[PDB]
Write a protein that binds this DNA or RNA. Structure first.
Ligand SMILES: [Mg+2]
Ligand SMILES: [Zn+2]
Ligand SMILES: [Zn+2]
Ligand SMILES: [Zn+2]
Lengths: 262, 88, 518, 93, 84, 58, 168, 171, 35
DNA sequence: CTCGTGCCTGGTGTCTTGAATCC
DNA sequence: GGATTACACCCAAGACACCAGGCACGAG
RNA sequence: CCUGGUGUCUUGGGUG
């Protein structure tokens, strides 16, 4: 058995291509003298090929666009063969982490599994809004909080049993969502409970002004700053903001420019 | 929010032509919501700090993706003064 | 003064001792062990403990105090973590020196191949400089091609020594098994070399130019990586609510992911030829994390296609830490504009535009002789000249006079500071780039004037090599009593009339005035 | 304030001015060091007034320094590459 | 130990431009922090001016510690050094 | 020049930097031993005693 | 805060466990080494003080300073009021009163007699004066370092100490 | 355990204190700051010797701040206890967990598992005491204990004793 | 030192044997084979 | 009402072969 | 085989890809 | 009723 380096993600394609070549050449004068070929997911970027002569390995891969042209094949020891073909949990009452949907990343208890053996019913702390803005994603979801049936009663619900309600077509029993997930959609290994899981389980600014005394008499402006007695008017006419005393200003109101009786 | 004045914006979020503006005044008001009331964040555009003038014209349209799209052109007049450069 | 009071004694630095950080010491200063490459808890706010933004490493946010020192983000220096490596790897910087050490010592017990009995070698240990001594020793021992079990017993093991060669990040040693036969060069892994180095005696450690307390030779192999705090790798917001991570943050994630997969191998399905591909990849990421300009191999790339900014590249070149932030840097209290000439200014004056004079400031200490004068400036405020911008108490709290509506109710105490506007006869340092010689920086006396150019008396254009065709010049304002006196008594224009370059003046009567005086 | 302006102040001999420009008028920073091991490993809670270098088990021999922030940054980048820059405040010969 | 006795002082008896600048600045600084002034202050009230007045009358109460290359030093008072 | 190489080599051979150069002190922000920094200034306790007694520290 | 003549204590390759203070093993730490140096660099033996010496020096220093505070103008409760602050008042009063109830030779006449009698490691010489003993059997048990020295006089030491000792 | 130690203190002086009695101010300043204070390195500093004649040296002016730095070298009486040292004491309190004894400045705690069984706490007696027949431990009774451990708080140090050994106890 | 450096460099910035800047470069670079 | 197809969002992971002088 | 190649300053002009899985809508 | 944050990395075109 030789290993061969191939383009990442193209290992299954190379195994396929080798099979087509083998079957197409069976019984001809130039058979492909390989016995088998395979690719292990755990071993990214490699295909393994079974034969008697190295030349057959080169023959199997000739012209394959997914294989690195460098003469990189390597020999496997007989004592390493079976480990290449090693094929490899989940119990009711145990915890898993959800891998998809608004509950992605959340800890859940395994309640039960389907007869066929694919999806598992999970007990989950819900993330609900009680229909508050109706007329969901994992990035725009809700905080987790146990289902409250009286809140649902008040705001937006079918009773099914003691402590069991169907609310918006999902089932909540004693405050928890019970929802089926594909087993492939949950993580059962190396779960690390989090901290949180251990805990749980002046009236004239900006108004337009006219100046009635001084060298700037008759000009429009806006009150930029009115700290005290001395105002800052941003004059319109030249690009300058001036310091000015409060006796000098007329303010606009409902009827004309009004003195300091506004 | 920015430190400048917002009092020159109309209700459509856009300033109108004819209004004089000075530096750091907001001329286009825009917000972005904060992900998980009191939910948004300011994303407004202030006039460049060293400039002034008059808003001349405001284009409103949509872009290739269908969202709203604005342009604000400001005009001012530059008068020669000590330090300006000239050449034959 | 901008620093809150601390009872620890203030001292200056007299010596910098360089050396290596031992593995033990890295753990002793670390405040957290780093294991998980997922930065966020689960994208629901608050970053994950044990992750790369664990809050024990520090705060780069104005509203979260450091859970280690209690100080705000301004004072908090940041605290290091550590990352345990499943397998020891080489430090990319030290490989050529490691290679040199192999030819010096025995690859079984680690003893120096020569003794004081060799007369030339006894002369070489006397050389006082550690680097030259180490080289002189290696120059002798290089030709010694077998570690002798017996003196020419010395503690030797009798084995012949290999010729070690570097091939990228890997070292190959070719042993000559005992005319010509077949030699088998096997790879000299970091772990293999690591054990050999710990058995080197203290007496041979010194003779190799290393140092028992500060640079012990097995510390050139990396077993635990120090995790720098977030101050070294801050996040930036590209378009306000979207933030990307620093190149180091992404690269540390790659090392951390790669570290977990080395743990994932030794407990189950390892087809050996896979162990070598995964361990070499951990070596790769740790190498390009420190130096991504390794000759003879492709650079690590970001997904954008451009090369990763390694730590080595952070320090070198015009914009790096040393030439760009330490030998020179951007500074406060500076100004710049176009210059114009004025014959009706004294030689040592500079005309300063009013707008510039209201932005710059000098912190004048309040005393009995000027307290009445300084109160007048306070009433005028930041917008009327001559005025003032801040009042600074002995505790350091600044009162911003733009927003103080009860400015009339301030009474000044002796010892406070008032940051007043720049005013007539204050000395300032004036400067035009490129600063080719010392009279590119002379002290002038300010004269505040209308219009926006800097004014120079015409006879100083020559030492600056300035003219008025668009040139700009820089002005710097000293910020204390001590430096004002240094400017006026050492750098002032009249002291600079004669230059030491050619024992003659560098300023004279020029252009119109010189034409006219004839 | 570039490299060439630095040289001009040396030529003038204005050492005091050059120090102030590059510290008080810029990025001045206060750090704490351990008097034994010389590292910036001190954990300093100033309102509790308690200091400890955990490595040396030292709560008494501790100094404060005024250095540029960009120098503090430099030393932390060197630490991240396993280089130990030990700052001592006294000579020994 | 390092200190050199008064009778055996060898460095120049004139105040250098660098020593002068440091003395004026340091003394100026102390006056602005309300140190007792040793001369009469008339019309000239700037901190630098008062310090320059004290220098001209040989009344600045400071000592220069001039370090020699080996680390030894001669202490010279500003009262005894000749100022041009 | 050779900025990073110097520093790696300096670490591996435990170099001691005695901080007497101008450049050392400039980048650490300390008063450099040059010009106005080439000496220390001490307070003349002997000359202060010629002042009158009402100027005395309590 | 406050420091001494002894400095640096930079790191060494070999650690040391002769530092932990053990009066039995003559380990007084790095500050109380056998050979100290004063503020001029001169060599000097460690100054360990018996209860009798210490009572004279401290009381003399306080009354000479008290006289100096009075421009030049006995009981322990009066001597402790010279200090400044209630914190200082406490430690000084408690130290005199403690010495007032355990110092055998409470005057300088007897003390100088004990001084000449005692004036060989300097720490052991000071220990023998502080701890009263009757016989040779009692001294080498409570102070087990006097075992293997083979130089008694011990008995005549204790006899003179007990004879100079006034009744009570 | 009493010693004489040559110590020094860095003193920073504000420029407004630069008058003709500067040294006398510093002498008062040194005493106020040092007398009665404790450190783990030296112990309790009881009294400073020759306070009115201390030579303070010359003050270094700090560049950039104007303040002056004095190194005041001095000589003091210091008190530090030591592990292994046998000492006498005066009992301050008696409790079910042992007793507290004032040895000059500080207090030493001896716990119950290191006290011999025949010494029985007797509250009914007037006044309360640890009693035997020819032994009498009331407040002020000379007792002989041995310091078996020193703990340091750098502000006040704490030492634990024992009377679980030969010849130690009341006399 | 610095005064010497500037005094020599500044004239060079404004300036059959080799002369001028190429000759100056040979000296500082103490080339073994001059032109 | 159920099934199939298309579109959108989220997560994970690279690769057909194609400027000149000095030490 | 790399490292070296003036200084400072202004301003305008830009941004991951592919595959797989899940959900929703439309048609039979 | 004091505090108060708006990006980076390049490339290109310019000024002395
Ligand atoms: Mg020009
Ligand atoms: Zn912190
Ligand atoms: Zn060997
Ligand atoms: Zn330490």
């Amino acid at each position: 058995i030789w290993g061969v380096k191939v383009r990442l993600g193209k290992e299954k394609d190379v195994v396929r291509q080798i099979l087509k070549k083998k079957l197409a050449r069976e019984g001809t004068k130039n058979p492909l003298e390989i016995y088998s070929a395979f690719q292990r997911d755990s071993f990214k970027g490699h295909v393994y090929i079974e034969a008697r002569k190295a030349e057959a390995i080169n023959d199997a891969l000739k012209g394959n666009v997914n294989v690195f042209s460098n003469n990189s094949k390597f020999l496997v020891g007989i004592v390493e063969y079976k480990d290449l073909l090693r094929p490899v949990k989940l119990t009711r009452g145990s915890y898993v982490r959800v891998k998809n949907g608004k509950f992605k990343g959340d800890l859940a208890q395994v309640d039960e599994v389907l007869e066929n053996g694919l999806e598992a019913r999970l007990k989950l702390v819900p993330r609900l809004d009680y229909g508050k803005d109706l007329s969901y994603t994992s990035k725009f979801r809700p905080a987790q909080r146990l289902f409250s049936e009286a809140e649902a009663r008040v705001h937006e619900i079918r009773r099914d049993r003691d402590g069991f309600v169907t609310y918006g077509g999902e089932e909540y029993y004693e405050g928890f969502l019970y929802k089926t997930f594909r087993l492939q959609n949950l993580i059962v290994n190396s779960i690390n409970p989090t901290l949180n899981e251990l805990s749980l389980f002046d009236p004239t600014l900006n108004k337009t002004v006219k100046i009635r005394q001084g060298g700037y008499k008759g000009k429009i402006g806006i009150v930029k700053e009115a700290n005290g007695d001395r105002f800052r008017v941003e004059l319109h006419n030249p690009n300058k903001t001036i310091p000015i005393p409060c006796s000098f200003l007329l303010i606009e109101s409902t009827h004309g420019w009004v003195p300091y009786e506004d | 929010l920015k430190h400048g004045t917002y009092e020159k914006l109309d209700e459509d979020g856009l300033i109108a032509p004819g209004v004089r503006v000075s530096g750091d005044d907001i001329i286009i008001g825009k917000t972005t919501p904060i992900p998980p009331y009191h939910t948004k964040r300011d994303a407004s555009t202030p006039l460049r700090s060293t400039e002034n003038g008059i808003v001349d014209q405001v284009l409103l349209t949509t872009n290739q993706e269908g969202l709203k799209f604005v342009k604000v052109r400001m005009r001012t007049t530059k008068v020669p003064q000590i330090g300006d450069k000239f050449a034959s | 003064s901008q620093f809150p009071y601390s009872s620890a004694p203030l001292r200056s630095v007299k010596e910098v001792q360089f050396g290596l950080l031992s593995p033990e010491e890295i753990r002793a200063i670390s405040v957290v062990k780093i294991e998980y490459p997922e930065i966020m808890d689960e994208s629901r706010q608050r970053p994950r403990e044990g992750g790369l933004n664990d809050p024990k490493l520090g705060s780069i946010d104005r509203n979260f105090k450091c859970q280690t020192c209690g100080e705000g983000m301004a004072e908090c220096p940041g605290h290091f973590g550590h990352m345990e490596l499943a397998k020891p790897v080489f430090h990319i910087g030290f490989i050529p020196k490691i290679k040199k050490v192999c030819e010096c010592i025995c690859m079984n017990c680690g003893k120096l191949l020569l003794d004081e009995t060799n007369p030339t070698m006894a002369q070489a240990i006397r050389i006082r400089d550690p680097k030259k001594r180490f080289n002189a020793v290696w120059q002798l021992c290089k030709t010694k091609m077998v570690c002798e079990a017996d003196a020419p017993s010395r503690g030797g093991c009798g084995n012949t020594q290999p010729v070690v060669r570097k091939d990228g990040m890997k070292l190959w040693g070719t042993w000559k098994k005992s005319r010509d036969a077949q030699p088998e060069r096997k790879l000299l892994t970091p772990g293999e070399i690591l054990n050999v180095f710990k058995h080197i005696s203290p007496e041979d450690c010194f003779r190799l130019g290393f140092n028992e307390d500060y640079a012990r030779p097995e510390w050139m192999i990396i077993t635990v990586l120090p995790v720098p705090p977030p101050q070294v790798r801050p996040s930036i917001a590209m378009d306000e609510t979207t933030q990307g991570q620093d190149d180091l943050t992404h690269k540390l994630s790659d090392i951390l992911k790669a570290n977990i997969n080395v743990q994932k191998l030794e407990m189950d399905g390892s087809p050996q030829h896979i162990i070598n591909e995964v361990e070499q990849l951990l070596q790769f990421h740790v190498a390009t994390y420190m130096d991504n300009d390794i000759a003879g191999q492709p650079q690590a790339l970001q997904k954008s296609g451009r090369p990763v900014k390694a730590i080595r590249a952070r320090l070198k070149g015009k914009e790096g830490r040393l030439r760009g932030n330490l030998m020179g840097k951007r500074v406060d209290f500076s100004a710049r504009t176009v210059i114009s000439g004025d014959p009706n200014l004294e030689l040592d004056q500079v005309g300063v535009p009013i707008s510039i004079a209201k932005t710059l400031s000098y912190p004048e200490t309040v005393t009995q002789y000027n307290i009445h004068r300084l109160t007048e400036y306070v009433r005028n405020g930041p917008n009327e000249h001559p005025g003032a911008k801040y009042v600074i108490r002995d505790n350091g709290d600044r009162i911003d006079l733009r927003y103080h509506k009860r400015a009339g109710d301030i009474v000044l105490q002796y010892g406070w500071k008032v940051e007043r506007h720049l005013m007539d006869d204050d000395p300032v340092l004036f400067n035009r780039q490129p600063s080719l010689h010392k009279m590119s920086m002379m002290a002038h006396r300010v004269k505040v004037m209308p219009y926006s150019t800097f004014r120079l008396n015409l006879s100083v254009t020559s030492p600056y090599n300035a003219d008025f065709d668009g040139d700009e010049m820089n002005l710097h304002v000293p910020q204390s009593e001590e430096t004002r006196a240094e400017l006026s008594q050492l750098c002032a224009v009249p002291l600079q009339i004669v230059s030491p370059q050619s024992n003659k003046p560098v300023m004279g009567i020029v252009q119109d005035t010189l034409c006219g005086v004839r | 304030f570039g490299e060439m302006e630095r040289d001009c102040m040396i030529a003038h001999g204005a050492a005091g001015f050059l120090k102030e420009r590059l510290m008080e008028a810029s990025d001045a920073f206060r750090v704490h060091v351990c008097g034994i091991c010389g590292l910036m490993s001190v954990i300093a809670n100033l309102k509790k007034n308690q200091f400890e270098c955990r490595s040396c088990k030292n709560k008494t021999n501790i100094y404060q320094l005024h250095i540029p922030y960009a120098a503090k940054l430099l030393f932390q980048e060197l630490m991240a590459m396993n280089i130990a820059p030990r700052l001592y405040t006294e000579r020994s010969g | 130990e390092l200190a050199i006795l008064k009778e055996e002082r060898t460095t120049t008896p004139y105040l250098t431009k660098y020593e002068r600048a440091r003395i004026l600045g340091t003394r100026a600084l102390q006056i602005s922090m309300n140190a007792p002034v040793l001369v009469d202050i008339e019309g000239e009230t700037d901190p630098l001016q008062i310090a320059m007045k004290e220098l001209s009358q040989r009344k600045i109460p400071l000592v220069i510690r001039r370090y020699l290359p080996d680390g030894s030093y001669e202490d010279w008072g500003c009262d005894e050094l000749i100022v041009d | 020049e050779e900025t990073v190489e110097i520093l790696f080599e300096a670490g591996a051979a435990a170099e001691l930097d005695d901080c007497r150069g101008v450049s050392e002190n400039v980048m650490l922000g300390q008063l450099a031993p040059m010009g106005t920094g080439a000496f220390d200034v001490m307070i003349d306790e002997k000359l202060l005693t010629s002042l009158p007694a009402d100027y005395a520290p309590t | 805060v406050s420091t001494s003549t002894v400095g640096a204590r930079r790191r060494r390759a070999k650690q040391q466990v002769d530092d932990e203070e053990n009066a039995t093993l003559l380990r007084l730490g790095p500050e109380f080494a056998l050979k100290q140096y004063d503020h001029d660099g001169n060599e000097h033996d460690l100054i360990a003080l018996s209860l009798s010496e210490s009572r004279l020096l401290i009381r003399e220093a306080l009354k000479a300073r008290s006289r100096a505070r009075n421009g030049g103008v006995i009981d322990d409760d009066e001597l402790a009021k010279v200090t400044s602050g209630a914190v200082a008042n406490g430690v000084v009063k408690k130290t005199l009163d403690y010495l007032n109830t355990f110092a055998r030779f409470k005057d300088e006449e007897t003390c100088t007699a004990v001084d000449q009698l005692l004036h060989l490691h300097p720490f052991e010489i000071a220990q023998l004066s502080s701890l009263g003993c009757e016989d040779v059997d009692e001294a080498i048990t409570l102070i087990p370092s006097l075992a293997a020295k083979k130089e008694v006089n011990l008995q005549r030491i204790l006899d003179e100490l007990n004879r100079l000792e006034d009744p009570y | 355990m009493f010693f004489l130690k040559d110590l020094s203190l860095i003193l920073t002086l504000h420029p407004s204190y630069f008058g003709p009695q500067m040294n006398q101010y510093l002498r008062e300043k040194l005493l106020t700051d040092v007398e009665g204070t404790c450190t783990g390195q030296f112990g309790y500093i009881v009294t400073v010797l020759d306070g009115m004649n201390i030579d303070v040296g010359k003050g270094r002016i700090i560049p950039g701040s104007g303040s002056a730095e004095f190194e005041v070298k001095y000589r003091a009486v210091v008190w530090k206890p030591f592990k292994g040292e046998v000492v006498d004491a005066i009992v301050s309190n008696v409790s079910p967990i042992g007793f507290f004894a004032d040895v000059g400045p500080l207090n030493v705690f001896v716990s119950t598992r290191l006290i011999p069984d025949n010494l029985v706490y007797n509250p009914s007696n007037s006044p309360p005491a640890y009693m035997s027949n020819d032994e009498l431990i009331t407040k002020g009774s000379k007792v002989r204990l041995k310091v078996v451990g020193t703990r340091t708080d750098v502000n006040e140090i704490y030492a634990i004793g024992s009377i679980k050994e030969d010849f130690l106890g009341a006399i | 030192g610095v005064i010497a450096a500037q005094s020599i460099g500044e004239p060079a910035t404004q300036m059959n044997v080799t002369l001028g800047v190429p000759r100056l470069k040979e000296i500082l670079n103490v080339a073994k084979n001059i032109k």
